[PDB]
Amino acid sequence: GLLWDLLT
Amino acid sequence: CQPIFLNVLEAIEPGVVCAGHDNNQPDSFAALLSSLNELGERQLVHVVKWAKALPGFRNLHVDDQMAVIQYSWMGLMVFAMGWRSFTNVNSRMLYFAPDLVFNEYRMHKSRMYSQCVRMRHLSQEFGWLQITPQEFLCMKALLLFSIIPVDGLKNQKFFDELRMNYIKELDRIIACKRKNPTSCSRRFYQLTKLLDSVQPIARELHQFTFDLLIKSHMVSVDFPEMMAEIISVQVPKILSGKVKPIYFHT
Ligand SMILES: C[C@]12CCC(=O)C[C@@H]1CC[C@@H]1[C@@H]2CC[C@]2(C)[C@@H](O)CC[C@@H]12
């Protein structure tokens, strides 16, 4: 998700 | 001796975030909640950038880094909103953002008046307890590590260590100008009670947003991508009791 991308 | 930990928390504290709400239009449930949702999406971006810069956060398994953010965002954001409301308008209104300030009329129009008054009460506590900016920063950081799953995190041990260290830092902040162990104990009692008070509020909001997401299409409320994913996947784990807050008191 966009959150995962944001986190990584 | 420089306060390294506190220096870091102050340095990474997010700046002002606006909701993009049109305050020239008459208030409406759909517009108000759509703006709150957009503000949530915008703040989530800042919370992730902030969390990743917290001392020791990277020690957590990446899957756990994700989890803690997904479960604690509501509490984190409500706590910060309460602080803004206190500092900016002395709790007279809920300061969600410079362009999204809730007066009683908006609290009613939002259909979450009960939750709003509880958040206003939280805001008032910052003043009644004379919470310092530094106590606020440490407590907010601790809120990121205050809700975990029953099946445990990928590496529960690293999380437990990090949480313990943040509690330790809160102790240090309390003992700063306090040379009396009893005064420190009384302050710790006050702050842990305040921290605990955030959870029931966050739960009520979790329930409200979940219900709103389920019927969003018929009430014309828009949910941004990340918010919709988190509220449909992570929030229900909290509501179904699979993920629970860590309360200091019982
Ligand atoms: C976290 C936010 C937005 C950021 C903030 O300042 C606190 C506030 C608390 C109420 C939340 C809102 C985001 C959108 C939600 C979750 C709505 O769907 C219903 C409750 C709202």
Author numbering:
A (entry chain B): 99 to 106
B (entry chain A): 669 to 918
Authors' own words:
Androgen binding to AR leads to activation of genes involved in the development and maintenance of the male reproductive system and other tissues such as bone and muscle. AR is distinguished from other nuclear receptors in that after hormone binding, it preferentially responds to a specialized set of coactivators bearing aromatic-rich motifs, while responding poorly to coactivators bearing the leucine-rich “NR box” motifs favored by other nuclear receptors. Structures of AR in complex with FxxLF, LxxLL, FxxLW, WxxLF, WxxVW, FxxFF, and FxxYF motifs reveal a changing surface of the AR coactivator binding interface that permits accommodation of both AR-specific aromatic-rich motifs and canonical leucine-rich motifs.
The preference of AR for motifs with aromatic groups over leucine-rich motifs was assessed with a crystal structure of the AR LBD in complex with the LxxLL peptide. The LxxLL motif adopts a helical conformation, and interactions of the motif with the AF-2 cleft are predominantly hydrophobic, with the three leucine residues of the motif contributing most of the interactions. Second, the LxxLL peptide backbone forms hydrogen bonds with only one of the two conserved charge clamp residues, Lys720. A shift in the position of the LxxLL peptide helix precludes direct interactions with Glu897. This shift results from changes in the geometry of the +1 and +5 subsites mediated by Met734, which moves 2.5Å toward the +1 pocket and enables binding of a leucine at the +5 subsite by a simultaneous widening and shallowing of the pocket. Trp+2 reaches over Met734, clamping the methionine in between itself and Leu+1. Leu−1 extends over Met894, abutted against Glu893. These interactions likely explain the moderate affinity of AR for this particular LxxLL motif despite suboptimal complimentarity with the residues of the core motif ( ) and the loss of main chain interactions with Glu897.
